[PDB]
Amino acid sequence: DLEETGRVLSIGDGIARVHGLRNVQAEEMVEFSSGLKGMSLNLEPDNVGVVVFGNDKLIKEGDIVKRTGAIVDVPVGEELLGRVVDALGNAIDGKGPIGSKTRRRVGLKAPGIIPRISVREPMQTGIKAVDSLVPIGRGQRELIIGDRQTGKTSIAIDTIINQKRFNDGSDEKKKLYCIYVAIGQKRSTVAQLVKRLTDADAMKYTIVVSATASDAAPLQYLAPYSGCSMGEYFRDNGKHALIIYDDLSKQAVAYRQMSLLLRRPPGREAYPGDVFYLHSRLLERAAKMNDAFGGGSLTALPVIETQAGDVSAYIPTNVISITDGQIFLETELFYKGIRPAINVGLSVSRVGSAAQTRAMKQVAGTMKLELAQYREVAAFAQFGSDLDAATQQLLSRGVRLTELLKQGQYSPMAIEEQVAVIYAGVRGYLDKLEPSKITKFENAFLSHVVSQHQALLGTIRADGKISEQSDAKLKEIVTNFLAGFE
Amino acid sequence: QKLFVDKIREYKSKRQTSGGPVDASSEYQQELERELFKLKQMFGNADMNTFPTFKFEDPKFEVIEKP
Amino acid sequence: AATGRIVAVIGAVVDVQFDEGLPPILNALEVQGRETRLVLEVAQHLGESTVRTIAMDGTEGLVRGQKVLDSGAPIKIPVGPETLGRIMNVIGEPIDERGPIKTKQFAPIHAEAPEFMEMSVEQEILVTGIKVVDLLAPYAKGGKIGLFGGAGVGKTVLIMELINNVAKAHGGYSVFAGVGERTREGNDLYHEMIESGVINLKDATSKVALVYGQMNEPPGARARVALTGLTVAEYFRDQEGQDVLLFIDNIFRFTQAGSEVSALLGRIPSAVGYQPTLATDMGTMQERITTTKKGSITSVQAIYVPADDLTDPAPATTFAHLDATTVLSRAIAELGIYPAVDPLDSTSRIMDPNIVGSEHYDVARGVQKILQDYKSLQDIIAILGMDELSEEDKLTVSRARKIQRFLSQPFQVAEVFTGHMGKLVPLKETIKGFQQILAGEYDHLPEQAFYMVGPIEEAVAKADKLAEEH
Amino acid sequence: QNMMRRKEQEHMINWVEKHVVQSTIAKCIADLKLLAKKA
Amino acid sequence: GAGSIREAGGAFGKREQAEEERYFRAQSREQLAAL
Ligand SMILES: Nc1ncnc2c1ncn2[C@@H]1O[C@H](COP(=O)(O)OP(=O)(O)OP(=O)(O)O)[C@@H](O)[C@H]1O
Ligand SMILES: Nc1ncnc2c1ncn2[C@@H]1O[C@H](COP(=O)(O)OP(=O)(O)O)[C@@H](O)[C@H]1O
């Protein structure tokens, strides 16, 4: 055990200027004499700038720093499912060590141009608004952006809970393993989230990487890359993963702290010059591999908190430029009763219909066109009774489809029931009903179709489309329940 | 074999526990009482060392025949 | 232990050179040859066996070469039931002229946050007796609350009303931490706690410990006094299993204090002029204010929002550390409605139908929705005027104004500001009154009948009196 | 039964380590033999 | 921007407030006398 070492020249704010270590590599993991870890970020002619994976009160001037000879890596594998880990993969839920066999570097490069195939398979969230108007595909990077307390973590948690129907089935092609990286959150918030995922039985296929608010800035910086490596394990082995960075604003803040303390040249909002490089090299790793590479995929759902809805800030601009679309949430829509508070006018999915089943495509094209016309003429509400019959019909259909998109928390819907509900909506079978009942109807009708009409739902789920027999049967079911509805 | 001295000579030392419930602690009881208080109070409040008796209710009913 | 010498004094920052035995970071050093006790907290090792430190008191009269002694530990404050009814400063000295604080154990003000396996998920509503809080953003037992507001919107009055109600209804050793606030308010609170019996100068059954570092303190004292109060509350939580209340006013000052030394510690400023270490400092402080499996800490923190921004890095960073934020608005205080709680900006993580019941949740959502609709209609009202509104919309505006007034409430501590009597509305009364206003059960009564009343029966009685007068 | 087993075995493991701290030229010679065995 | 006109202050928000107060003091008068 003969190791190459150096002396701590100085220590402060979690940065150790270290003498010696002549052969340390850039981004190499070193170990301090107190047992703490560090990463060599600055290789300078006379010193090395080490960022400390912990509390700097244990490091003193003169302490011995050993090399490890390895870039930072994390354990990967299926042994991590159901575990809560830190940024370095150490178990923090007290359930014993992670019995993993494989380790993967956190800073590997993304797949190139050729190993990819187009994003074509749907990633079902269970939220009607997302699955119909902002469809997400496997291999996509869809941003969840919004102000504080607007319902972003709820969208991520619904997407995680929804994959239980696929992970309990036998179709191995449709199974999605979830990963929830929590950066800069309270430990009690993460405990509430873990309890919510356990109650929904969603932990057995979920990893929770936890770099919380009291963890050092390097750990919050590194947690998204650790989670991304844990998901790349599945993406490389023919399986499909989903990863939620909650959120990337806090990782940017941690990286800015590390950079400013390392005396790196600050830029706009004091962020370093390579914060775009940071988020882009994190997000380009979510890919869809072709069959020659196993056909696996990794879907990224980064989260961004905007201040007062300012999407022209630095980090929102960067991550909006990087991703393949955005799900925008509004607090005004939240308090109007529209929940999930998705802004359909601003939300976008540049993958689009290529990430939808044919049935959802059928009903969702119509729903999108109708909601667009409604948004065009929606200012004329408060005067609707004094325009054409066409304008009043646009307003009526628009509010019906709007109430059709509201959804409860922690209750993701299967794609067949979403299609049935949107069918009842965009076919006109809710125009005679008044708005204050739509939601109620949407519930009762649902129960009906779940109880006595498993054949139609199963046939839609198996076909992926609404064939003419399916169309007619849906027609009769809807009209019968509507005629017999209170 | 300093630790190997430790590992055997100390596990042997702990094994000499004939009259020792907790291997010569002289402490850890001042907090054990708190842990067992918390653990018991969060599992319930009655005596969780005996079998529970059962009182059972009957649903309510009203006059339903045509008035 | 080890002895060094002052080699530089710039503002509240002091450099000390140790020949033997460099002290770890966060140690407390005592300056030798001073009338009062001056403590320097180590912040950086500069190399060449020199440490940079932050002064806990004034640096005037310091001389280069003056002797500095290492204590071997961080600032250790006395903890125990003897601190109840006493006032201590950042370094644990008694500042109430009542003599020393003879505890039997001392705790360092720097400690690690509780682990993840020590967290408790129990969420139980804490009824405060305030209408808007309990209705729209109710507080939970063992949760972190936070009260946001600009200068003069009512953070102190609301935190004092919470003290009054809860702490006098509580049996768990409250702890108040004045962090960079007015000394006048500290004296006021001390005496209104003595006269309330919560602090007893004899027969020591006091149930509140006070920790104070005010605006006239250096940046170091204002940055560490929150940790001192936190450490008192932490002893009460861990080593006694009690359920502690932790009032902090104001926590923004903590953050601000860091800024006032940041550049002097040799750090490039971040955005809006804040220390590069803002989020992590706030994290390592706030992650210790938490309920564990060993005890419970309900914490109410008044959070100053500079210039009514709410996007400034300090409040925006604080938002993610709280369970039930109460945001006070100047646009609401200028209407005359108190407390100035913004109903469309306050939040609670227990505003969940599976927790507060479907009736509570439905009433809260209906109130918020009618207020948002009133907001949307006020533009039409500005353009068209009121007489050209639909009748459903005139009804919406009437019920919305009535709900606005009914969210107001007279406080027991504001009896001088209003002349009114204090009202403590129970939870079911709040839900019932707001349900009845939303249902239309009081369309015939005026809107000034709901201004500064308690339960809805008081609104009815006030309307009857207002009519009987004219 | 688990929690009492955890506090105890924890109070054991820090005891046995603290109890050998209270407890050698053969080692000093063995160290140089190991440094020779480094090669 | 639902209450944007009266949150900005200014002539269009001060006239809205005056109009609201006029209408509802009228209605509170014609509601109290009918009690
Ligand atoms: N579809 C919904 N229906 C009803 N309530 C909802 C819905 N979605 C979210 N909420 C509620 O709105 C509140 C905020 O949602 P959430 O915390 O998930 O968003 P967030 O952006 O992650 O908040 P934060 O700023 O703390 O990160 C929560 O209390 C949640 O219960
Ligand atoms: N609940 C209230 N009732 C009546 N007046 C209030 C109330 N809250 C605040 N005020 C008024 O606003 C002023 C500012 O109160 P204060 O508690 O000092 O706010 P802050 O702590 O944010 O500076 C008070 O002097 C008082 O006149």
Ligand SMILES: [Mg+2]
């Ligand atoms: Mg969240």
Ligand SMILES: [Mg+2]
């Ligand atoms: Mg104040």
